[PDB]
Design a protein around this ligand. Structure first.
Ligand SMILES: O=C1CCCN1CCSc1ncnc2[nH]cnc12
Length: 167
């Protein structure tokens, strides 16, 4: 038993809810919240910008130190940093950005990072301003992640379409 509430069950291990991931994190305080990161951990907009704003920019400060020490992430890669006031940990995961021409096959590699954590709160990778089809993203998620994932979908219209088109 865990504290996630109001989710529709899609599979044995994947759950989905129309919710603002920032508000959901603040309420559940999950062990892991996933950020839709870029390789530079520049959290300017989309999910990343919202999460960072909710930390009063502490996520960005921590991220800049991480990059100064380690260099950029790989597309399809991840790193674990603090969850600040939102979660114990934040798993920063880089999905391919279609608006940068990045290979959509890297989406599966991106979701594989979730398997290193037993339970996560997450957005759909590569969705939103990353330009991929969220229905495809949900399919790759279901077919790749084996650990327990609670997906937060901000847009009610998108949420309804994702549910209604799910096989
Ligand atoms: O829902 C949507 C519509 C377009 C893309 N997308 C999911 C990524 S954007 C997001 N996802 C979850 N929680 C949030 N809080 C602020 N932004 C978000």
């Amino acid at each position: 038993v865990n504290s996630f509430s109001g989710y529709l069950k899609l599979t044995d291990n994947v759950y989905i809810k129309n919710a603002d991931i920032v508000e959901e994190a603040k309420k559940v305080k999950p062990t892991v919240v996933v950020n839709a990161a870029n390789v530079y951990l520049k959290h300017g907009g989309g999910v990343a910008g919202a999460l960072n704003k909710a930390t009063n920019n502490a996520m960005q400060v921590e991220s800049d130190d991480y990059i100064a020490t380690n260099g950029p992430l790989k597309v399809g890669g991840s790193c674990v940093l603090s969850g600040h006031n939102l979660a114990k940990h934040c798993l920063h995961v880089v999905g391919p950005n279609v608006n940068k021409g990045e290979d959509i096959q890297l989406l599966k590699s991106a979701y594989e990072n979730f398997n290193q954590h037993e339970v996560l709160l997450a957005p759909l990778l590569s969705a939103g301003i990353f330009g991929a089809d969220p229905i495809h993203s949900l399919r790759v998620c279901v077919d790749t992640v084996r650990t327990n994932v609670y997906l937060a979908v901000f847009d009610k219209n998108l949420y309804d379409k994702l549910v209604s088109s799910f096989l």
